[PDB]
Design a protein around this ligand. Sequence first.
Ligand SMILES: *O[C@H]1O[C@H](CO[C@@H]2O[C@H](CO[C@]3(C(=O)O)C[C@@H](O[C@]4(C(=O)O)C[C@@H](O)[C@@H](O)[C@@H]([C@H](O)CO)O4)[C@@H](O[C@H]4O[C@H]([C@@H](O)CO)[C@@H](O)[C@H](O[C@H]5O[C@H]([C@@H](O)CO[C@H]6O[C@H]([C@@H](O)CO)[C@@H](O)[C@H](O)[C@@H]6O)[C@@H](O)[C@H](O[C@H]6O[C@H](CO[C@H]7O[C@H](CO)[C@@H](O)[C@H](O)[C@H]7O)[C@@H](O)[C@H](O[C@H]7O[C@H](CO)[C@@H](O)[C@H](O)[C@H]7O)[C@H]6O)[C@@H]5O)[C@@H]4O)[C@@H]([C@H](O)CO)O3)[C@@H](O*)[C@H](OC(=O)C[C@@H](CCCCCCCCCCC)OC(=O)CCCCCCCCCCCCC)[C@H]2NC(=O)C[C@@H](CCCCCCCCCCC)OC(=O)CCCCCCCCCCC)[C@@H](O)[C@H](OC(=O)C[C@H](O)CCCCCCCCCCC)[C@H]1NC(=O)C[C@H](O)CCCCCCCCCCC
Ligand SMILES: C[C@H](Oc1ccc2ncc(/C=C/C(=O)O)c(C3CC3)c2c1)c1c(Cl)ccc(N)c1Cl
Ligand SMILES: C[C@H](Oc1ccc2ncc(/C=C/C(=O)O)c(C3CC3)c2c1)c1c(Cl)ccc(N)c1Cl
Lengths: 561, 576
Amino acid sequence: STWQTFRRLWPTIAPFKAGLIVAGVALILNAASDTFMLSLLKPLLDDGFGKTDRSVLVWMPLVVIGLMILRGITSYVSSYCISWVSGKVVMTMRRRLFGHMMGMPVSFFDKQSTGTLLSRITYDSEQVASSSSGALITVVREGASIIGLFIMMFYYSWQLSIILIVLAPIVSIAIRVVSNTMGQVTTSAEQMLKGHKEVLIFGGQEVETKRFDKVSNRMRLQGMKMVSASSISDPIIQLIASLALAFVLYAASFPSVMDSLTAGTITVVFSSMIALMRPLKSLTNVNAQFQRGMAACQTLFTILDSEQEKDEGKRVIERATGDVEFRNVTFTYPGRDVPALRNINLKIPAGKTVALVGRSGSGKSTIASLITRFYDIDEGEILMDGHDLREYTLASLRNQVALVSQNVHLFNDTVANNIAYARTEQYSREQIEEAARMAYAMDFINKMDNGLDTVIGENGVLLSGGQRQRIAIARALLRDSPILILDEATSALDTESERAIQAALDELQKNRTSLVIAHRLSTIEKADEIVVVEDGVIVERGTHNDLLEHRGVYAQLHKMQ
Amino acid sequence: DKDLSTWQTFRRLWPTIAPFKAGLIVAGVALILNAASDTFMLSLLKPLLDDGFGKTDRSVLVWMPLVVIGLMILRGITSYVSSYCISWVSGKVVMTMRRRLFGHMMGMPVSFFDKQSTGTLLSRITYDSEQVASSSSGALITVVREGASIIGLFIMMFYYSWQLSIILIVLAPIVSIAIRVVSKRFRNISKNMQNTMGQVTTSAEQMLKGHKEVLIFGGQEVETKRFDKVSNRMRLQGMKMVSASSISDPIIQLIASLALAFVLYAASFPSVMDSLTAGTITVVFSSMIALMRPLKSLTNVNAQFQRGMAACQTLFTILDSEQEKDEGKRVIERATGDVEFRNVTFTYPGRDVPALRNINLKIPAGKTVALVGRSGSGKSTIASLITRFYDIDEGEILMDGHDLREYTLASLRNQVALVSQNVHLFNDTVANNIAYARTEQYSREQIEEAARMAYAMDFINKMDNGLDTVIGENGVLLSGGQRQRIAIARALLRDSPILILDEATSALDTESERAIQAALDELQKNRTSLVIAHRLSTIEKADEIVVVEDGVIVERGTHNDLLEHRGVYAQLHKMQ
Ligand SMILES: *O[C@H]1O[C@H](CO[C@@H]2O[C@H](CO[C@]3(C(=O)O)C[C@@H](O[C@]4(C(=O)O)C[C@@H](O)[C@@H](O)[C@@H]([C@H](O)CO)O4)[C@@H](O[C@H]4O[C@H]([C@@H](O)CO)[C@@H](O)[C@H](O[C@H]5O[C@H]([C@@H](O)CO[C@H]6O[C@H]([C@@H](O)CO)[C@@H](O)[C@H](O)[C@@H]6O)[C@@H](O)[C@H](O[C@H]6O[C@H](CO[C@H]7O[C@H](CO)[C@@H](O)[C@H](O)[C@H]7O)[C@@H](O)[C@H](O[C@H]7O[C@H](CO)[C@@H](O)[C@H](O)[C@H]7O)[C@H]6O)[C@@H]5O)[C@@H]4O)[C@@H]([C@H](O)CO)O3)[C@@H](O*)[C@H](OC(=O)C[C@@H](CCCCCCCCCCC)OC(=O)CCCCCCCCCCCCC)[C@H]2NC(=O)C[C@@H](CCCCCCCCCCC)OC(=O)CCCCCCCCCCC)[C@@H](O)[C@H](OC(=O)C[C@H](O)CCCCCCCCCCC)[C@H]1NC(=O)C[C@H](O)CCCCCCCCCCC
Ligand SMILES: C[C@H](Oc1ccc2ncc(/C=C/C(=O)O)c(C3CC3)c2c1)c1c(Cl)ccc(N)c1Cl
Ligand SMILES: C[C@H](Oc1ccc2ncc(/C=C/C(=O)O)c(C3CC3)c2c1)c1c(Cl)ccc(N)c1Cl
C-alpha cells in the first residue's frame, strides 16, 4: 500500500520534479567533495611527508578551500531545491484539505474533533513532505557517499576492505537484535480546571492534588523509560562496529596485509571506514521514515476521498418572500435510528413569527438545522415558496436563511467586517454602523480602542456571550435576510443588559418570517403561532386566544418558565 | 541584561533541583570520562602510525584492538549512565514543577479561570515545563562534555607540537567574531515562522469551528482566499527558515577551514615540521577537526539555556500571580445557618453597572427564601457571593454574625451546599460523586440512603453496574433532571447548613419532577435555603419571596400575602 499511497501522491509532486533532479545532482557532488577530501589525506602524509614542502603548500590549503566552496554551494542548492519542492507540495495539499473539509457536510464534522482535523492541516501535511524529503536526501547522498567510500577503500587496500565486508552480515544482524499517560496528564489538569468551582466548595483540593501526583509520577517513569531505551541502543551498535574494526586493524598486523600500506593509505582507509558509520545508519532507518510519511499521507487521502455535501439543486431564487411548508417530514440522525422527527407539518407563513417550544429531549433544534439543509431528510418534504428545498442550489437557499444565536462563531477580523461577514465590499460602512446601532451593540462597541475597526482577533476574545449575540443580530439585520432562524436554547441565564437584546430581537423579528427555538417569554408571547414539540412529533399549536388555554402542554411548560 | 534575567531565574529554579544534586554530580563525572575516551583514541592514532609503522607488529596487533574496544566499552557505559542520571533528574524536576503549577492553579480566583481558556494554561504547563528541563539538560551536558573534550584536546595539541597549537589560538578570536557575526545576521528567525504558522492555524481552526456559519453566510471564497495568502506566506517562511541554516553553515565551516589551511600552510615550513612525525601530524590535525563539534555546541548553549529559563520565567509568572484572597482566620464547623446581607453592592470586575445595589435580606436559620424576579437581575449573582467566589464592593454579608471574609474560605465553603442542574460530574463512580471529596468519611450505607432520599435510585438501578457504574466522560451519561438529584444526594449526605438551590437552569420538564420536588422538600426542611426559584412548588412553600429587578429588592412577603398586595409579584403570576 505504502508505495501505492506514494504513486497517488506523485502527481502533486510531478510539477516540481525539476527541483528534485537538480537537488539530486547537488547531493551527489557533496558526497564527491567529502570523498575527495579524504583522498587528499594520502598525499599530505606520503607525498607531503616524504620531504616535500611543495605539497603542504599548494595542493592542500588551496584545494581544501576549493572543495569547501563546492561543499557549501551544493548543500545550499540542494537545501533550496528540496525546501522549495517541499514547500510547494505542503502548500498544495493544505489548500486541498482546507477546501475539501469546508465543503463536507456537518455529519462529517460531528465525527472528528476540530483539533484533529486542524492537526491534519498543520502537521500531517508538513510531515509527509518532510519524511519523503529526508528519505530522498538520505538515499541519494548517503548512497553516493558509501559507494564512493567503498571504491576508495578497496582501491588502496582491497585486503582490508574485503575483511570489513565479510564482517558486515554479522554486524548487520547484531545491530538488528538490540534495535497515553500524557493524555492522562492533560486530562487530569483539564478536569480539575473544568471543575474548579465544584472543587472549591467540597474542599476537594486534597484528592485532586493526590490524583495529579499519581498521574504525574506515572508519566515521569513512562517518559524515563523511552529515554533509557534509546540510550542503550547505540552504545552497543558502536561497540559492535568497533569490534569489527578492531579486528580489521588486527588484520593489519600480518605482513600480507600491511606491506601494501603507508602512513597515508592506512589513514584514509580507516578514515573512510569511520566516515561510513553514519550513511549506513541513515540508510537502515530510511525505510522507517518513509513509511510514517506515507501513513500520514494515506490518512489525508482518506479524508480527501470523503464526499462533500451534494448540491444538485439547479434552481436559483433571488429572494424568498414566501412561506416555508413542511409536509409529513421524518428525519433521523446518521449513526442511530430513533428518529428525532417523525411526522412534522408546520406552516411558517411569509412574514409572521412562529415560535416552537420544546423539552430539552425533543429535537426543537433539529428542525432549525433542517431548513438550512445542513442535513437532508429521510421522508416528507420541505418546500420554500412552494418548491422543495432540495430543488434549490445551496448558495441561494442559505442566502435566504439567516441565523442568530449566542453561540454563532466569530471570525478574527474587524468588528465591522465581522458584521458584514463575506460581504465586506457590498455594504457601505454607513449601513454597518446603523445595523450595529439598532441591535444595541454600539454602546458596548465604542468602548473599544479601535471601535468598529478594532479586531476581536488573535485570540483576544474581548467579547462575551451576551456581546457576541448582538453582533449576530447586527449581521442578520444588515444582510436583511428574508427568513430568520433564532436559537435561544443556549441559556445565557446571567445576562447584564438583556433589555438591549430584546429590543434588537423585536426589531429583527418584525415583519420578517421568523422561526424561533424559544426559551424566553417575551418572544413567546408576541409570536403569532406557537408549536409544542414532544420527542419527534408536533403535539399541538396555538395562537392568541389559543395561547390563553393550551390544548398542549403549554401550562406545564409555563409553570417551569 | 538577559544574562542577569536568566541567572536570577535559574537561582529561583535551583532549590527544586538541589535534592537530586547527586544525579547531576555522577552524570558530569561520566561525561568527563566520555570526553576522555575520545581524546585517548586519538592518542592511539600516534603510536599506530609511528611505532606501528616502525615495524613493531606488537602495537597494532596485541593491544591496539584491545585498548580501542575497552575504551568504547567505557564510552558506552559513561554514555548510558550520564543519560540515565540526566533523564532521572529531568523527570522529577519537571514533575515537581507540574505539581506546583497544578496546586497553584487550583487556588486561583474564579475570575482568572473564566477569563483564560484553560487550553493555554494546560498547553503551557505540560509543554513549557518539559522545555525548561530539556534545554537546561542539553546546556549542562554540552558544557561539561564539550568543555572536558576541548581542554583535553587542546592540551594534547600542545604536548605534541606546541607551535601549531598557538597559531590556532591567535586565529581563534578573529574566527569567533566572524562566525558570531555570520550567525547573528542569518539565523535567529524561528519566531518569524511561529507568527505565520499561527495565522495558518487561526484560519484553519475558525473555518473548521465556524463551518456552519460559513455555509449560511457565503464565507467560502473569503475563507479560501484568506487561507490561500497565509499558506503561501507560511511556505515562504519555511524556506527562509531553511535558507538561514543553508547560508550560515558552510560559510562558518569555510571560515574555520581557512584558519586550518593557514595552520597547514605554516606546517610546510622547516621550523615546525622538523620536529613532527607522521604519527603526530595526524593526531594534531585530527584533534583540530574534532574541536569543531564541541565549539559549535558551546556557543549555541547560551541561546539554548536562555530558551529554558524563559520558559521557567513564564511558569514563575503564574506562580507569582495572586491566589484567592483568604485572610479570614475564623473556622466554624457546622455553622447554624442564618445569612444576613447589609447594604451589599457588587459589580462584576470590568463592568460599569452594579449587579446588586444596596441589598438587605436576612435569611433566618432553618428557613427558605425564594429569589424570584425578571431574568437578568442579580438573584443568580447573590448566590455566587455567599460562597465568596467574588467579594462585594460595599457593605457586608454575614454568616452567623460575622462577615464571610472573616471566615476561612474552606470553613465558609463547607457550610454552603450547592444544588443545580449544571453541577459537574467528575469522571468516576456514582458513589464517589455523591461523597465527592469525603469517600473516607461516609459509609456505603450512608451513601446508599442519601441517593434514596434524593429520589435518584430509579435511574441508578437501571445502570450497567448500578451505583458503582462509572459516570463522567464529560458528564455524558447523565441528564439535567438526573444531575439535580445527584447534586441533592451530595447536599443530603454532607448535611450542609446553608443550601443554595438554583432552579433557573433546572428543567421542570422531567418525567420524574414530582420526585425531584419530593427530594427538594426533604432537602430543605432543616436548613437555611436561598432559592433562585422558578417552580410552582418551591415558591408555594417558601417562607419569604423577594422580587429583584436591576439588582434591587423591590418587594417582600409571603405568597398569599404578596398576591393580596397585587404588586410586582402578581403581574408575573398573571402572565404565567
Ligand atoms: O553533518 C555534520 O554532523 C554530523 C554530526 O555527527 C554525529 O552525531 C552522532 C550523534 O549526533 C546527533 C545526536 O546528538 O545524537 C545525532 C543526529 O541525528 C539523527 C537522530 O535522529 O538521532 C541521527 C541519525 O539517526 C540520522 O537519522 C539523523 C537524520 O538527520 C534524521 O533525519 O538523525 C543529530 O541530532 C538530531 O537528533 C534530534 C533527535 O534525536 C531529537 O532530539 C533531532 O530532532 C535534531 O535534528 C535537528 O536538525 C535540524 C538542523 O540541525 C539541521 O538539520 C538539517 O538537515 C538534516 C539532515 O537531513 C541533513 O542531511 C535534516 O534531517 C533536518 O531536518 C534539517 O533539514 C534542526 O533544524 C531540527 O529542528 C527541528 O527538529 C525537530 C524534530 O523533531 C524532534 O523532536 C523531538 C525532540 O525535540 C523528538 O522526540 C522527535 O523524535 C524528533 O523528531 C522538530 O520537531 C523541531 O520543531 C518542530 O517540532 C517541535 C515540537 O516539539 C517544535 O519545535 C515546533 O512545533 C516545530 O518547530 C525543530 O527544532 C532538529 O532539531 C538533532 O540535530 C546531531 C545534531 O545535528 C548535532 O547538532 O546529533 C555522534 O554520536 C557522532 O559522534 C562523535 O561525537 C564523533 C565521533 C567520536 C570521535 C572519536 C573518534 C575516535 C577515532 C579513533 C581512531 C582509532 C585509532 C587508533 O563518533 C562517532 O560515531 C565515532 C564513534 C565510532 C567509533 C568507531 C571505532 C573506532 C575504532 C577505529 C579502529 C581503527 C583503529 C586504528 C557524530 N559523528 C560522526 O558520524 C562521526 C564523525 C566525527 C567527526 C570526525 C572526528 C575525527 C576523528 C578522526 C579519526 C581518524 C581515525 C583514522 O566522523 C567521520 O566521518 C570521520 C571521517 C573524517 C576523519 C578525518 C580524519 C583526518 C585526520 C587528520 C590527519 C591530517 C556528522 O556525522 C557529520 O560528519 C560526517 O558525517 C560527515 C563526513 O562523513 C565527514 C567528512 C569529513 C572530511 C574531512 C577531511 C579530513 C582530511 C583533510 C585533508 C587534509 C558532520 N559533517 C561533519 O562532521 C563536519 C564536516 O566534515 C566538516 C569538514 C571540514 C573539514 C576541514 C578541512 C580540514 C583541513 C585540513 C586539516 C588537516
Ligand atoms: C563491517 C561493518 O558492516 C556493517 C554493516 C551493516 C551496518 N548497518 C548498520 C550500521 C549502523 C547502524 C546504526 O548506527 O544505527 C553499521 C555500523 C557501521 C555503523 C553497519 C556495519 C562496517 C561497515 Cl560495512 C562499514 C563501516 C564500518 N565502520 C563498519 Cl563496522
Ligand atoms: C582557530 C579556530 O578558532 C575557532 C574559535 C571559535 C569558534 N567558535 C565556533 C566555531 C564553530 C561554530 C559553529 O559551527 O556554529 C568555530 C569553528 C571551528 C568550528 C570556532 C573556531 C579553530 C579552533 Cl580555536 C579550534 C579548532 C578549529 N578547527 C578551528 Cl578553525
